[PDB]
A paper describes a structure:
The chordoma-associated [name] variant brachyury was crystallized with a 26-base pair DNA sequence and diffracted to 2.15 Å resolution. As would be expected with only a single substitution, the structures of the WT and [name] variant are very similar (RMSD 0.8 Å) with only minor differences seen in the ordering and conformations of various loops that are presumably flexible. The [name] substitution itself lies in a loop between strands F and G and is situated away from the DNA interface on the opposite side of the protein. The conformation of this loop is significantly altered with a new salt bridge formed between the substituted D177 residue and R174, possibly explaining the altered conformation in the variant structure. Furthermore, the [name] substitution is within a GGP peptide sequence that lies in a restricted region of Ramachandran space. The PHI and PSI angles adopted by the glycine are not permitted for a non-glycine residue, particularly in the case of a pre-proline which is more restrictive due to steric hindrance around the proline Cδ. The crystallographic B factors indicate this loop is fairly mobile in both the WT and [name] brachyury structures with B factors slightly higher than neighboring residues for both structures, although the potential stabilizing influence of crystal contacts cannot be ruled out. The [name] substitution is however close to the site of the small protein interface that is created between subunits when binding on DNA containing T-box binding sites in a palindromic arrangement. Thus, it is plausible that the substitution may affect the cooperativity of DNA binding as has been suggested previously. Analysis of the interfaces between subunits using the program PISA22 reveals some very minor differences in the interface areas (210 Å2 for the [name] versus 219 Å2 for the WT) and in the calculated energetic contributions towards toward complex formation (−4.8 Kcal/mol versus −4.5 Kcal/Mol); we consider these differences to be unlikely to have a role in the biological activity of brachyury.
Brachyury is a transcription factor that plays an essential role in tumour growth of the rare bone cancer chordoma and is implicated in other solid tumours. Brachyury (encoded by the TBXT gene, also formerly known as T) is the founding member of the family and was first identified in 19275. The DNA binding domain forms an immunoglobulin-like fold and contacts DNA via an unusual insertion of an α-helix into the minor groove. All T-box proteins recognize a common consensus sequence named the T-box binding element (AGGTGTGAAA) with family member-specific variations found in the preferences for repeats, orientations (inverted or tandem), and spacing of such repeats.
Residue numbers in the entry:
A (entry chain B): 40 to 224
B (entry chain A): 41 to 111, 118 to 224
Amino acid sequence: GELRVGLEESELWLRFKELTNEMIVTKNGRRMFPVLKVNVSGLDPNAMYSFLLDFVAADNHRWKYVNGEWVPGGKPEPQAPSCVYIHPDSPNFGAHWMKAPVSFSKVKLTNKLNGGGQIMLNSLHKYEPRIHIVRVGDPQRMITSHCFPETQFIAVTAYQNEEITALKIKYNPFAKAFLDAKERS
Amino acid sequence: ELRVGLEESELWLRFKELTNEMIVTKNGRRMFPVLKVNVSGLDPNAMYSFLLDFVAADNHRWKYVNGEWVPQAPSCVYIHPDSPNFGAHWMKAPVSFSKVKLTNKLNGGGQIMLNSLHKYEPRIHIVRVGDPQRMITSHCFPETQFIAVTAYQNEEITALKIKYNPFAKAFLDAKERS
DNA sequence: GAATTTCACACCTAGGTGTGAAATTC
DNA sequence: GAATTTCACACCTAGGTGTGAAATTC
Ligand code: NA
């Protein structure tokens, strides 16, 4: 159709996804890396929208890193998608959302109910980021949802795959101290 | 019904008594203290934007002579970054203009150009988004008057800045050490 | 000269990284 | 016993302070 939400920097995302991506969750909440950013077109420049982010459980079980490989390791469990995170620019005009990429750089993932906007995930479960565009002031309350398969990841309390850790060190600026340390060897 | 009151007024008057001063720089300088207001009496479900500008507090240039201050169009506006937003949001917690930058030359976004050694009064405006009538409220805060400067001149003001602005903790610590 | 502005600087606030040892968990 | 979670730590990014010598204006 006319509404288009495209993943930005999809090739960085794909490098993580080849290895099976992992996202740290902590007690106090952990930012994602890479950050989910999208390009939006086809909105009404003059309408009002809010952007929401939640995380759909990518399957019905859990996951285990056994001998350098991820292994389905659970008996089936229920349904729940996560709570929602509201993009901080919400609410805003379509034109604002279309002028630059919509970046969810401040969402924090956690493994505990204490949500200052934090998204509680279940460790060792796999998730698929999903973005909702909510039209504000609409008597029909129209909402459109987009999933981003290349951003799937497994929530962990510590990195399992050492190749993931290396990629995170390579590209996340807040991890630069470990990057420079590897270039020292 | 619509009320907009100054937050942390007593920290402002401590500055006000000494004649308050705000640094401007080429790029842009944050205010200290930060202007924060409480809002009540908005429609919780209506959409509003909050705007900030600065009005001339008098007609004189100023200069500092032996420990005393002796003896102009409105500034551009700064839109609070939470705009646009529901009345509920503006009312749930103080509205704080913590990221506005005061400058002597516009060279970037989020900046208000003032002209140095003049006295200015902050003014806040509220507008309803989509209001078919062109309707604005304005709210002045004489307690927050100040003189723009490129360097502090009353040493007593600098002392208060160092005492209360957390980003100047290195100079507070230093003086405690001496 | 005297008055006002710019600047590089040291030192903070504020907060995001993975590490690795220890605690917890089943 | 061993998988999972916790958490104090060093080391970053990012950027807000006043300072004082230097530059600019007057
Ligand atoms: Na400027």
